Amino acid sequence: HKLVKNSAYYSRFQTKFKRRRQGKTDYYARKRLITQAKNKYNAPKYRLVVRFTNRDIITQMVTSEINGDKIFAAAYSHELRAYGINHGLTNWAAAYATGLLLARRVLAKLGLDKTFTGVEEPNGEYTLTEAAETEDGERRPFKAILDVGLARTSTGARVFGVMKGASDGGIFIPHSENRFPGYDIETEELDTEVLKKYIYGGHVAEYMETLADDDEERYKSQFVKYIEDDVEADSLEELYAEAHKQIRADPFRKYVSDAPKKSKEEWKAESLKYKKAKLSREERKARVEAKIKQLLAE
Amino acid sequence: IKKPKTQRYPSLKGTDPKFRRNHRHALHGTAKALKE
Amino acid sequence: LVVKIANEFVSEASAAEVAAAGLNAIREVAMRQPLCMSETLLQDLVLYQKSKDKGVMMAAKGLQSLYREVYPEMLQKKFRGKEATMGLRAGEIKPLKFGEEEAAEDIEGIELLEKYKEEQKKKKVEQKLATTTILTPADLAKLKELRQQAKLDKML
Amino acid sequence: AQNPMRELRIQKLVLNISVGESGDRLTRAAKVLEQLSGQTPVYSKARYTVRQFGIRRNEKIAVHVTVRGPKAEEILERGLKVKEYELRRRNFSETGNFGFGISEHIDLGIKYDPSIGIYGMDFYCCMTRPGERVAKRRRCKSRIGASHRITREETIRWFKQRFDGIVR
Amino acid sequence: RKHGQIPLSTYLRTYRVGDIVDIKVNGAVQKGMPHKFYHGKTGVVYNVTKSAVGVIVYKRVKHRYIEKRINVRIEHVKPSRSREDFLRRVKENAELKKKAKAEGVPVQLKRQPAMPREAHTVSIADNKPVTLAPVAYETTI
Amino acid sequence: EPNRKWFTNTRVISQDTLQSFREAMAEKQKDPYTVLLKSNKLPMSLIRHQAKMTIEREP
RNA sequence: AGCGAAUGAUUAGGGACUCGGGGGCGCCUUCAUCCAUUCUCUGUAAGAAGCCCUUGUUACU
RNA sequence: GUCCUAAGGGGGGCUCAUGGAGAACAGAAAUCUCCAGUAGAACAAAAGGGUAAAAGUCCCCUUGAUUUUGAUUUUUGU
RNA sequence: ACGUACGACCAUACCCAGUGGAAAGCACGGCAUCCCGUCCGCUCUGCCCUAGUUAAGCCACUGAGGGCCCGGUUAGUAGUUGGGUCGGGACCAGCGAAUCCCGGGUGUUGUACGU
């Protein structure tokens, strides 16, 4: 007969933050991510926010201000259809391509696009961008810190695929090789060939080969759009290489999303048409009087 | 109780040693800059 | 005997004084012979240090400390402490066994004494011991001092 | 109400054997659970010392195994065949789960090994609806709605429809 | 201040030497607190470090004041609006004096306290005065 | 200071024990040559209307 | 700083009782042992040493 | 005379006390399952302050529980 | 205006019930070869975006809901600072609350990409 949820409990209840009640922000990690040394003053601390959705990847340059965060640059996985990748936009190779695209976009916006060019041919080796031989002198590489959010940082996660994409694009992201999908904990040596296979999406290719050999029905159920648009297991490496070359060529391509298209005012008018509105004070008082009449009848 | 007097240029004693080390070299550099 | 003392003396219905007396007796028996325990029983008895009674707390902490010097493997990783975990990680601490006696082929600190003699010889040049060299009493005192210094370094 | 993602399904089936004593009896009970489920069972220690039960803290006194998928349906069907497809109405919880208990594990179809012995079991079937990942996931964890929560009556009707059982 | 998470804009304030800041001790974090006294006091930043600032306070002892230098973390300090009314005034007065010198007509350069009010006319149309007794007649009822 | 032991009985004794003690102590007073030992520690406190009716019936 | 259901009591009726003690003739006992029961929650600011622009120095960033 | 005067650091995962409803023996109390649960648990202050993707608990590596020099507070040296 | 990502104030945002959701985005979802972690692919991780569904999350609306927040009053009242050769508390000069009640509400907003 205990009533835990009473008026005293509701009055003494102290809510969490809104983005923690929604379960979207880890403020304990976010504090360490956004604090800058006070002797460094107004030096921005750029972070690569990476988030993974069921059908998309969201990769951003984020800076922190006292009243909000600013997006310096942003690249999404669905924009790779303009570069060629129109299948598997949430896999490890698409994560790498999105990270490379974001790195090229932020370097082009900063203007260091020609001074800092990363590794142009992906090899799968643990490398970090260093100081470039500028004619003026030594230019330190542009630095950003990875922010994975609430993702479990296990070995083989695509949060490190986007990391490797930015590191190959030219951003100095401090990182270690032990969470790449070729690392062995016992040996403590990274497998460059397996990492390159994940770069060019060869794990998906050998998956379709294995499925086509053993279980044709499951292959047709899962990889149906690959069959429909006639992309094979052997063509994935060339497709991703051409996509990387096109990304390094034109980082600011525009993609038509094939969704219904209107203007901001037209979408505003449509959303106001499909919008139930709150009752006025007079209407609320009228329904309160109706409830009072019902109570008097009762 | 009168307020104590203050110095226009306070002594850099409790300041961060790294900033003090850089600041003294900056003072020497601007010193030869003024001597030039 | 230890199981009977644990059941009759250290139980949920037992008084605090009865539990403290039983744990003290168990600690005495464990000092005299440590192999009487089971690991689960010892961890259960060490968990009585969280008791609100001071006597039960100090008796359980005495039992835990005794097994820290004697046999830290039965103790939980939370309860081992610093030196026990470092010794178990490095491998110096060995399991205690019934009937096991020391079988040191060389004297304790003889390696340190030989190292000190080699350092003195190297200093003289710049300016096996048990088999051939006669054990001087000054050399034995120096070896004891070196063993004490090595024990202090291992403790640090 | 008839929406095909409101259909009831078995979230899990948990098999429990609380021996009350450690050693060979618990080892053979774990052997029974392992050969039944196909998975390695997990042991459960006592959390406080009870003198009248002959148990103490940290001493292992129980064993259990959680099985999901069609294997859970098969094991539940065998247990219900032992229980002659008949349950008493108290066995259904207010949260939509149910459970029962058998006294001999040889009624499940397991052979009698004389070294192993005879042990009884507790079967607990936890039900769910599609959309429990909302309450089980790490990022954006939320609560299941009242219209989506399973009711004791719905569990009883689902049992009577699928397993043609008699709840009385 | 509620229990739980510290707001994160405390870490995003940029601190320089010479700034005027006050000390509000945050009970949640124990590292970097000043003494019990020097809480709620306002002083001048003389040293800025990676995660803390040095504040000059003037304590009183007997019949004199002693300068004190304290190292307090950024989590317990807050910018003080004591000189906000001076900085806004100096910027406003500087630009106003520049505009007045450009135009030719001199303006008021000093803030003036509350002067007595001037003469004005109050009309009794639609605001006819009501007569009040020392005690309200409704109250007497 | 408030305490629970202010509101408890401090000395209790049973019927048979009190009766036996009184009978034995009376037998001890019967002899004038027998005196108690440690009498200060003994419970010796246990050992140690016609006009009104007429006035009530007739004032 | 101290108090504390981490407390203060109750135990008639029920047992275990047996050498706990003791008595009588190994056997019963008479007390007594306990257990089972229960009750009690005051700081700072209000400028010419101040503000703004330009310009260097640095091993700091 | 014996015994106690307390294991810290980094990272990761998970929520505690308790209540309701259920499962052969199993009941007031053994293990298992769901829901509710702002801390009512735990952290070596028994009713002080502070902590919930942690400052609690568990797991993996570790001894920043290391040398050296000034400054500040409690106020000549500590 | 509506979503998504990162956010600032951190209940006007929380908790309990119902009702609805164009477009896209979400989400539930499907499959365990590889990376990875479990008593259990439950969680985590990998692959699919095809199918199904707005059932739940999420958003919006509703409630003489609990709570929370903001105004009037309470009240120039309580209280407090000085004055009198004032009485046996009231005046003079001034500062000046919060309850109780009467009501209202039930989130604003930055950056970037889209519908």
Side-chain angles (χ1 to χ4, degrees), chain A residues 1-132 134 137-281 284 286-287 290 297, chain B residues 3-4 6-36, chain C residues 1-101 103-104 109 130 137-138 141 150, chain D residues 1-167, chain E residues 1-97 100 102-141, chain F:
Chain A
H1 291 170
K2 284 283 136 164
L3 186 62
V4 183
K5 292 183 163 178
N6 44 5
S7 173
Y9 169 73
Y10 286 138
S11 172
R12 298 181 44 177
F13 197 85
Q14 293 179 356
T15 68
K16 304 294 178 190
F17 278 10
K18 191 181 186 182
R19 286 190 61 87
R20 200 260 162 275
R21 289 198 259 98
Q22 292 173 340
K24 293 177 178 182
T25 305
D26 192 359
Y27 287 94
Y28 185 82
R30 181 184 156 81
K31 174 203 163 313
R32 280 77 178 273
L33 281 166
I34 75 170
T35 58
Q36 179 81 289
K38 300 289 94 175
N39 51 21
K40 299 198 179 184
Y41 304 103
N42 285 349
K45 204 162 192 179
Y46 296 80
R47 52 195 192 100
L48 194 151
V49 164
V50 64
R51 298 295 182 270
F52 285 93
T53 301
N54 265 354
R55 310 175 61 180
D56 203 15
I57 304 172
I58 302 157
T59 67
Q60 294 170 336
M61 294 298 103
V62 176
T63 51
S64 307
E65 325 280 351
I66 191 167
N67 55 34
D69 285 13
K70 312 299 181 196
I71 312 296
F72 194 87
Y76 293 81
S77 185
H78 58 73
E79 308 174 353
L80 298 171
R81 305 169 170 269
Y83 297 93
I85 318 163
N86 47 2
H87 294 285
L89 294 176
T90 59
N91 49 34
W92 207 90
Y96 176 80
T98 312
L100 171 59
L101 185 58
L102 178 62
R104 294 277 85 190
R105 285 181 172 177
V106 64
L107 284 182
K109 185 166 179 175
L110 289 164
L112 295 178
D113 196 14
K114 302 288 108 178
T115 61
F116 292 113
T117 296
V119 62
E120 302 180 5
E121 69 275 16
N123 220 30
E125 295 171 344
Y126 171 63
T127 58
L128 301 93
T129 67
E130 297 173 0
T134 300
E138 278 197 358
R139 188 91 155 182
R140 293 190 303 178
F142 177 66
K143 191 172 51 186
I145 53 180
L146 186 69
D147 183 16
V148 305
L150 296 174
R152 171 61 174 158
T153 58
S154 69
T155 310
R158 308 183 299 255
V159 299
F160 312 118
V162 184
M163 193 272 259
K164 196 57 169 60
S167 185
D168 298 1
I171 311 178
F172 171 66
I173 297 196
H175 74 121
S176 298
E177 61 176 14
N178 47 6
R179 298 298 186 192
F180 283 156
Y183 199 82
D184 182 25
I185 306 193
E186 325 289 338
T187 310
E188 298 184 353
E189 294 293 337
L190 175 61
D191 202 350
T192 289
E193 161 67 30
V194 179
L195 188 54
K196 194 170 175 179
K197 172 180 58 169
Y198 269 74
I199 295 279
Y200 285 103
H203 57 287
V204 187
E206 65 192 9
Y207 192 22
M208 320 190 300
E209 298 273 0
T210 306
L211 282 178
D213 297 354
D214 312 318
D215 201 349
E216 190 72 21
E217 303 179 1
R218 201 212 305 175
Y219 172 65
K220 291 174 175 175
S221 177
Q222 290 283 304
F223 299 93
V224 55
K225 293 304 179 178
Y226 284 77
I227 297 175
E228 291 187 0
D229 301 338
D230 204 8
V231 295
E232 309 168 357
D234 304 351
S235 65
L236 294 185
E237 192 273 331
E238 289 84 14
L239 170 66
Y240 282 120
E242 181 74 15
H244 300 336
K245 182 174 73 175
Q246 282 187 123
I247 282 171
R248 300 195 92 106
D250 195 4
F252 291 98
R253 284 190 177 178
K254 182 64 69 177
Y255 181 75
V256 185
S257 69
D258 204 30
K261 311 275 188 171
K262 294 183 182 180
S263 174
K264 297 287 180 173
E265 188 69 28
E266 325 293 332
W267 287 118
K268 179 162 187 174
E270 200 84 9
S271 52
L272 294 174
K273 288 198 291 288
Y274 302 102
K275 185 173 187 179
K276 199 177 182 187
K278 282 189 173 179
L279 313 176
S280 70
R281 295 179 66 250
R284 198 185 313 273
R287 297 176 72 257
Chain B
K3 207 66 176 297
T6 178
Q7 183 66 41
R8 179 177 178 180
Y9 313 106
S11 175
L12 276 74
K13 179 169 63 67
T15 312
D16 197 8
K18 205 178 188 185
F19 168 76
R20 186 179 36 210
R21 202 176 319 167
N22 184 55
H23 184 240
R24 293 305 180 95
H25 294 319
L27 291 198
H28 307 133
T30 194
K32 276 74 70 177
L34 267 297
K35 297 296 289 183
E36 196 272 330
Chain C
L1 301 169
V2 173
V3 169
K4 174 148 195 171
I5 295 169
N7 289 345
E8 306 281 340
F9 285 86
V10 189
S11 198
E12 70 273 24
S14 300
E17 303 88 8
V18 187
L23 274 167
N24 280 327
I26 285 178
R27 181 191 61 79
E28 298 277 343
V29 176
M31 294 183 286
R32 269 80 166 178
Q33 168 80 307
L35 274 298
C36 64
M37 295 296 172
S38 76
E39 182 164 6
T40 61
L41 182 61
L42 173 60
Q43 295 161 355
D44 184 22
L45 292 192
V46 170
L47 280 170
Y48 271 90
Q49 68 177 353
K50 311 262 287 191
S51 298
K52 312 183 176 202
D53 183 32
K54 299 296 181 184
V56 178
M57 179 258 294
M58 293 182 286
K61 293 199 81 192
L63 188 56
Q64 171 188 350
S65 307
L66 167 73
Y67 266 96
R68 271 169 163 178
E69 289 92 8
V70 172
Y71 198 81
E73 182 188 7
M74 293 180 183
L75 278 173
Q76 316 176 192
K77 300 182 175 181
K78 174 184 189 179
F79 291 152
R80 286 168 183 174
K82 182 178 176 176
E83 304 186 9
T85 54
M86 305 185 89
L88 287 166
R89 178 65 174 172
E92 294 99 10
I93 308 185
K94 297 296 289 183
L96 198 74
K97 294 141 201 164
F98 182 75
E100 197 270 332
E101 297 293 327
Chain D
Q2 63 84 30
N3 190 357
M5 293 178 70
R6 281 181 52 91
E7 56 90 20
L8 264 65
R9 40 203 300 179
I10 294 175
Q11 179 186 2
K12 53 181 172 183
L13 177 70
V14 180
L15 308 173
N16 187 46
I17 302 184
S18 175
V19 187
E21 58 211 359
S22 178
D24 62 358
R25 286 256 290 170
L26 190 53
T27 307
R28 300 192 312 264
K31 185 183 287 185
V32 169
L33 286 190
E34 179 173 358
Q35 63 84 210
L36 182 62
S37 60
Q39 319 167 354
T40 300
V42 62
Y43 292 73
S44 305
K45 303 155 171 280
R47 64 180 194 272
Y48 50 81
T49 78
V50 189
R51 185 177 179 179
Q52 324 282 2
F53 292 162
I55 69 170
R56 288 195 69 97
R57 178 170 48 180
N58 184 340
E59 157 182 350
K60 293 187 286 185
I61 70 178
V63 68
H64 67 106
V65 57
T66 294
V67 54
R68 313 165 171 269
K71 196 153 53 184
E73 270 98 356
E74 172 197 0
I75 296 179
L76 184 63
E77 281 270 0
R78 295 160 63 177
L80 283 168
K81 186 180 289 293
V82 172
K83 291 293 290 184
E84 71 262 8
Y85 293 161
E86 207 274 342
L87 270 72
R88 186 266 182 275
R89 189 176 175 87
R90 178 185 158 80
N91 295 13
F92 294 82
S93 178
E94 65 168 9
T95 62
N97 315 301
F98 70 100
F100 51 91
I102 66 180
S103 292
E104 297 174 356
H105 75 281
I106 61 170
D107 307 347
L108 297 200
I110 317 165
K111 67 182 290 294
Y112 172 82
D113 172 328
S115 70
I116 291 185
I118 300 298
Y119 314 86
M121 293 177 70
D122 291 25
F123 284 58
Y124 209 79
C125 182
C126 307
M127 294 299 291
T128 190
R129 283 196 168 106
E132 200 68 29
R133 201 186 184 278
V134 177
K136 296 296 180 183
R137 71 198 174 201
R138 177 167 155 87
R139 184 178 172 275
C140 297
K141 176 190 311 182
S142 296
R143 290 194 187 180
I144 315 299
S147 56
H148 213 57
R149 292 200 288 260
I150 315 190
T151 300
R152 180 177 167 185
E153 305 297 324
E154 310 177 8
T155 310
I156 288 179
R157 303 192 298 101
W158 170 85
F159 176 76
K160 292 182 181 180
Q161 188 274 331
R162 173 178 170 88
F163 299 99
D164 70 291
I166 303 298
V167 183
Chain E
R1 195 259 163 186
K2 71 182 204 157
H3 314 99
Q5 179 72 33
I6 296 99
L8 281 193
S9 65
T10 304
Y11 309 100
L12 299 177
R13 308 202 198 98
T14 294
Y15 279 81
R16 300 164 216 277
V17 288
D19 299 348
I20 299 297
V21 287
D22 59 7
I23 312 298
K24 188 171 192 172
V25 170
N26 198 351
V29 181
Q30 286 84 23
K31 297 213 70 180
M33 292 180 183
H35 204 256
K36 179 62 70 179
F37 182 76
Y38 311 159
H39 161 78
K41 307 285 182 183
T42 301
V44 189
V45 174
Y46 81 98
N47 187 18
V48 65
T49 317
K50 181 174 72 68
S51 284
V53 289
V55 183
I56 299 184
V57 194
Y58 288 84
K59 193 176 185 178
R60 75 151 311 172
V61 166
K62 282 197 176 179
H63 300 85
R64 68 164 185 173
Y65 289 81
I66 315 174
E67 183 178 1
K68 303 288 188 181
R69 303 186 162 187
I70 62 171
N71 296 354
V72 176
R73 276 211 153 181
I74 60 173
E75 293 179 353
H76 315 275
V77 304
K78 174 183 47 178
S80 175
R81 301 165 48 191
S82 65
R83 290 182 72 89
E84 176 269 351
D85 197 23
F86 181 70
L87 294 174
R88 189 223 42 73
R89 187 157 46 90
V90 65
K91 299 315 172 188
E92 182 65 26
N93 209 342
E95 62 86 20
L96 183 63
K97 189 178 64 175
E103 205 273 343
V105 162
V107 290
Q108 183 62 255
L109 188 153
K110 293 183 184 183
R111 47 178 183 169
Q112 296 316 93
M115 296 303 186
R117 293 176 292 112
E118 69 275 16
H120 59 274
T121 301
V122 181
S123 66
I124 66 173
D126 291 331
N127 199 7
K128 178 186 179 181
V130 297
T131 309
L132 306 177
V135 59
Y137 291 158
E138 293 179 353
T139 301
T140 66
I141 291 296
Chain F
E1 296 291 333
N3 200 261
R4 294 172 171 263
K5 309 196 61 182
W6 300 124
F7 310 94
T8 56
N9 302 327
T10 70
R11 308 188 188 191
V12 295
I13 189 178
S14 64
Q15 295 297 109
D16 268 5
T17 307
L18 176 59
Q19 183 66 41
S20 312
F21 178 51
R22 286 183 173 173
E23 190 276 331
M25 261 303 323
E27 182 65 26
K28 256 59 183 181
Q29 280 102 21
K30 297 296 289 183
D31 215 334
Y33 286 74
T34 61
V35 308
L36 311 160
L37 305 178
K38 303 179 181 180
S39 53
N40 54 351
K41 294 182 183 293
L42 290 175
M44 308 290 322
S45 177
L46 292 169
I47 304 303
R48 314 173 194 150
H49 294 88
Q50 287 86 17
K52 185 64 64 67
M53 295 298 102
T54 48
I55 295 313
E56 281 181 350
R57 67 180 65 252
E58 316 173 7

